[PDB]
Every structure is written in C-alpha cells, then in structure tokens.
Amino acid sequence: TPSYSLTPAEASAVAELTLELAAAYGSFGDPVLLRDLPRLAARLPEGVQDFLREFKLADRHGHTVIRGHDFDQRRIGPTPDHWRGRVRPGPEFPEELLLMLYSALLGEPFGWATQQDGHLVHDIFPIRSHENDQLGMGSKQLLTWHTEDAFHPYRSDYLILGALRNPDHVPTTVGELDLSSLSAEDIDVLFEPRYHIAPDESHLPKNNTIATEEEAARFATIQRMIDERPLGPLLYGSRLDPYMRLDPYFTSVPQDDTDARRAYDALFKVVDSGMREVVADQGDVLFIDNHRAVHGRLPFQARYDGTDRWLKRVCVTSDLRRSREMRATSATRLLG
Template identity: 50%
Template sequence: MASATDRLSAVSPDVAQEIEELTLRLAKRYDGPEDEELLRELPVVASELPAAQRRFLRGFALDDALGYCVVGGHTVDQTRIGPTPRHWRGRPRPGPELAEEILLLLYASLLGEPFAWKTQQDGRLVHDVFPIKGYETEQLGVGSTDLLTLHTEDAFHPWRADFLLLGCLRNPRRVATTVAELDARLLDPAHVRTLFQPRFLIRPDDSHLAEHNAPSDAYREQFAEIAEMKRDDNRVAVLWGDPAAPYLRIDPYFMEVPDGDDEAAAALAAVGGLLERRTEDVVLRPGDVLFINNHRLAHGRRPFTASYDGTDRWLKRVSVTTDFRKSRERRGTATARFI
C-alpha cells in the first residue's frame, strides 16, 4: 500500500510564489500554449522547478507502480484567470490562465512530450475541463449531472497518453475526481488470463466525434477514421505487461465483447466490478496538479450540478507520451504535436 508521502507532494507558499513568477514571465514571453519556441524550451526551463518535486515525479514515472500522485500548493490567481468560461470555443487565445497552462506543460515535459488530438477540442494542446450547458448527461469532461464512468484516457487508441495531467484552477463545490488502481491479485486467475487476450471490442469515446468539434476540412480524414473506428471490430486486450502487476486499458462504457464470448463478458465484468469497488475520491483544490499513470489508473468524475455562473469547477488537461516516435507517421513534422 502506498503511503501518503508517495502520493502527495506540496510546494511551500514561498516556492509557489517563485513558480508563479516564473510562469507569468513565460506567459509574457510566448504566444500561447502551442508556441513552438515554448514547447522546445520546456524541459530546459523545467529545471527551474524545485528539485524536490522533480525528484518526486521522477520516482513516480520510473517506479511505474502508482496510478496517480498529486503535486499541490501552487497559487492560482482567481482574479487574473477570471470566471469559468461557458465554452472552450471562441475564447481569446491565449486566455488569462496561460501561466497555469504553462505550469502544466512544464510538469508534462518532465515525464515526456505533451501531445494532443486533431479530433478533440478543435485541436488544442491544453484542454479545458469545465461543465458546458447542454452536455450535462454526456460521458465527457464537460458533462456534469451523470457520473463520468471509470476509464483509461483515450483507451481505444493505440497512441493514447502514457501520462495525463489535470491541473485544478478552481473547484469550490469540491467535486471529486474518481481514481481506481488495479490489484490484479484480487482477480480470478482465469479472468486474468482472458483479460490478457485481445477479446474485447473498444470504440472511441464521444469527445472525438466531429459533432463535438468545429467543422474542419483540414481534419476530415481524422474524423472519418474515428467514425470508422466506431464501426470497427477493434479487439484489444484489457491487461498487458507484467503478469504480476499488469497494465490496464479499460473504458467499459465504450466496450463490448463479441457475441457468445461468455468468458470475456465475465472477465470484463469482474475487472470493472473490482475497479468500482476500489474507487476512491480525489478532491482537487486550486493549485493541485493530478498526475495520472494512464496504464495503471482508471479515472472518472462524480456527478454534480453546474451553476454556469462563472464559479464552476475548472481544470486543465494535458496528455503526455513517453514515445513520440510511435505516432511519427501521423505528425507532419518531427516536432508536430497533434495526432
């Protein structure tokens, strides 16, 4: 069992202020979160983050044992960032929260390379997670009244993130992110064997659909591919890696088993049930950064009622890959970040 010190690290108020000065300086110097120069500099500038937190994250990534950890204590100037927006589309870019986006990117660069999807949030590198009117019951980061069910981020995709960062800007009603790590020793060994086999159908989640993005001719091919994957017979294994402590790839809401494969159905129900029983709440506070090992943790979000008055919960999200090369065929240049 991990102790609290393995999972939590906090910067002191003095250090938080130094970090904010750093990110505000960077926010003045660069055009936005997608500025090529900024992205090139990230790991260089990240050496200015405190050694204690860099060492903490190095352990998290290298030991590859925990599903999540939190680095807290950063300052978020609630006045500067302004009210929680109503939508991510149509906002000024960069927004007043660029310093907070840069902080996430700096941390991301300690773990790998930040990247994003052409088919999500109109191809932005740093995503917004806040409730949007009309999407209440959707299985999306912008949903609210329905439980966002446990999932691996972009579980359907072979190039899904190795790490996912969620940075909290505000969360006044203490809405919890849900987290569940897998202890495969609690599963029937027969189910584990089945889960290691590619017997599970998985489909893209709805955030990648063209209807949730601005109409874009440039990315027609990518949206067509997502539509194809929705129809496809894409069969994957749920578990992989070390049999004693397997990696996990799961999004039960978007998964099925082929007709008649009762073994697969039972194994999927068993692992889904186990994760649900082991689910814990993590209530992020402003200035907390949640680091998710996307091969070890399923995550989601508790239901809540949004007020749409500018005070709603607001997170920022960044995906990180430890192997940029695997998606090279899809990125026009070596430094392009959109798949």
C-alpha cells in the same frame, strides 16, 4: 498513494517562474516554447522534479497529486462561459504553462485536432449548452470511469489535471487494479486477445473529411481496426503488476466466450469497488497514469456565473513519433 505538498516557498517559486515564462513567451503558438519546455521545467523546485521522476520510473502507482500551488484568483479571473471565442492566451496562461512544464517532465504534450480547436491545454468547466452531456464540459451528468481512449493505439500515457478552482470540492474518481483480488486463471484470460474495444465516435474516420489521399492514409489504421475488428487483451505488460485498458462503455465481450465474460465481470467488480474520490482543489495538480488508473467525475450543479469549477487538462505521450501516421506534419502535435 504518495503525494507531494508544496511549502509556501516552493509555491512562491513555482508561481514566480510561471509568471516570468508567461511574460517571456507570447502563446503556445510559439514553437520555441514547445522546444524549451523540458529545459524550462528544470527550473522548477528540485523536490518537485525528483518526485515526478520517481513517480514515472517507479511505474507502480497509477496516480499522484502535487498540492499547495498558489493560483492567483484575482489574476485568473472569472470562469469563462465558453472556450470558443476567448482571447488566446487568457490571463490564466501561467497555470497552463505550469501544466506544460509538468508534461515535459513526464513526456510530450499532445492533442486531438478536432478537440477544443487543437489547444494543447484543454479547458474543463461547465457550459450551459453542454449541460446534458457526458464529458469535461458537462456538470449534471455522471462521467463514468474509464481509461482514456481505451481502443486507441496512441492514447495518452498520462493525463495531467490542474484545478484552477473547485469551490464546492467536486471530486474526480480514480481507480487502480488490486491484482490480489483476481484469480490467476482470470488474469491469464484478460492477458489474451479476447475482447473488442470499440472506437469513440470522435475517432471515427467518417466523422472527419473524406477528401484526398492525404487525409485517407491518416485514419487508415483506425479504419482497419473498425473494418477487421481485431480482438485484444485488457491487461498487458508484466503479468505480476499489469497495465490495463478498461472502458466498460466501449468494451464488447464475445457472447460465445464464457471464460472472457467471467473474467471481465471479475475485473469490472474489482475496479468498481476500488474506485476512489480524489478532490483536486484549487492549486492541486492531479497526475493520472492512463495505463494503471481509470478516472471519471461525479455530477454537480453548475451556476454559470463565472464562479464555477475550472480544471485545465494536458495529455501526455511517451512517444510522439509513434503516432506520426495520424499527424499532418512531423512538427504538429495534433492527431487527426
């Protein structure tokens, strides 16, 4: 798995850029900043730019890491208790800007309207009231591995995770597909529309307002997937080096299909045993290809004292316009 280690000079260059940008722009509520992101990202070190571009175009590895970022701990401050009720933007705004610049190198940053007040950069840190919960804000509970939003037609193409701090070196789990570990019959079956992938509860149209024609037409495609229950493949693209969409928790193998179940069990075993622990430490930015890797997080003991693990999260789409029907306006980047 190729990575890129920043020299101090590059690290210093990136840090300097993020600071200048943070001073020059007010918040992410500025549409000019979203407009300028790709051009602004051209001012990152050249080696970084070539690296990510090579990662994007190679379409081979399902993750990569850029290590060695200078994340100024004094300026960033204490890990917050909650995301709710924070001044926007925080003093860690430069790091958020960084991840947005990276996101423009891969595609477009986008979000989910119901998630963390629609912030394009998500917070991942322990919250005490979310202790017994399986998500980013958890800690005690194991975050089993998955493709992000496996059922969803407009799911992220890439995820970007930037570790502001991770004092106890808590690893993220990521797994790829070892294609030589599967029989050619199984591959053929997994390529065929023989599986049901269930929506996550947050994507359910009964969760969101049952008001007006306006909002009904916004979930009509999901509603149809729920109603009709179309069956779909779990491997796609090239038969030789395939994309996958695997979330074990929401995948249903039809009982009568003995071939589908045999192949799924083989696909599951290969991916589970292939899982790797990747530690995103302070100043690491982990890039995950959502079509080639799955990801999870191991359980850890939080302290809720402002010294806790803190990652930032940005989701990337390679085609913002493909999801227009699920977005209120053309300008808005929030599905739902």
